[model samples]
Target: AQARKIPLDLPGTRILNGANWANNSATENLATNSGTLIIFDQSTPGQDADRWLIHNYLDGYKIFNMGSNNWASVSRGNTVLGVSEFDGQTCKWSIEYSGNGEEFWIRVPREGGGGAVWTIKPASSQGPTTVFLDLLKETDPNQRIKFAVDPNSSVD
Candidate 1:
């Protein structure tokens, strides 16, 4: 499969602290299973941030935290680099564009192999609907950098 950088442009190498994330179908905030700080702000929050960077691993890719100690892995399959968590390697996903493509549906591979990909419904509730990963450009003000995912920004 052809590899592409995940379109979400982020600082070259920056840590996103105090950021919150959750699943689109969940009702609560997603944190480490052991309740450890899930902040990905550089350092080793415990030891994982710097070790497992979240730079442009692939184009148009977004990974799930999965409440694990490390950032989940994305393995190459036939055509797409399927993503899976530590819980199971069989976990795979595909994207389905909606409307004009601004929004999309995440289709998760089914268990037992070859049944039907599970499509994620958009988050409608307020409490903990979608897993929001926020990276602020102002957090590290000293560095002068731009992200590739920004449509308005040009590559320097």
Candidate 2:
């Protein structure tokens, strides 16, 4: 095999926007306000669905949105970014490596819509390390998002 080349604009960054909609495909890039897009809950009324936890290298920011319930709370986890939607109950996904980046195999099920779990990967595993949807470019010049070694960073 040949060498691999990352295609993400940023080096160590990510962006997540939460919402509830229907994208053409599960791996489709998130959009502003539409029926085929995913939206993350932003500590709002009727949207107190699920909350995600963050650790080192992860951060959260807020965006301004009015009238349209399509705004999302931004969350950055190291080099990984994502936008989650409120299914009114639970939301979860698995992590796995594609080419040079990572992805979450999400499974969004409606309350009475019969939920099902499935695995979804990025659009192009070779188009730079990125989590499509929001336009976030990694910054860290180390050519890495987070831990690229072992558990050496874990300590007491």
Candidate 2 — which residues are off by over 4 angstroms? 1-104, 112-122, 132-149
Residue pairs with clashing backbones, model 1: 4-58, 4-59, 5-58, 5-59, 6-58, 6-59, 6-60, 7-60, 22-131, 44-47
- The regions of model 1 sitting more than 4 angstroms off are 1-90, 110-124, 130-156
Which candidate leads in TM-score? Answer: 1
Q: Write the per-residue lDDT of candidate 2 for residues 1-156, one digit (tens) a residue.
A: 222322122221222221211111122434532222222222322221122222211121221122122223222231222333432122222121223433222222233432222211242232222322222223322112211112321221
lDDT, candidate 1, residue 125?
A: 30
In Å, residue 126's CA in model 2 sits off its true spot by 2.9
What shift in Å separates residue 140 of candidate 1 from its native position after superposition?
37
lDDT of each: 0.26, 0.24
All candidates' TM-scores? 0.29, 0.19
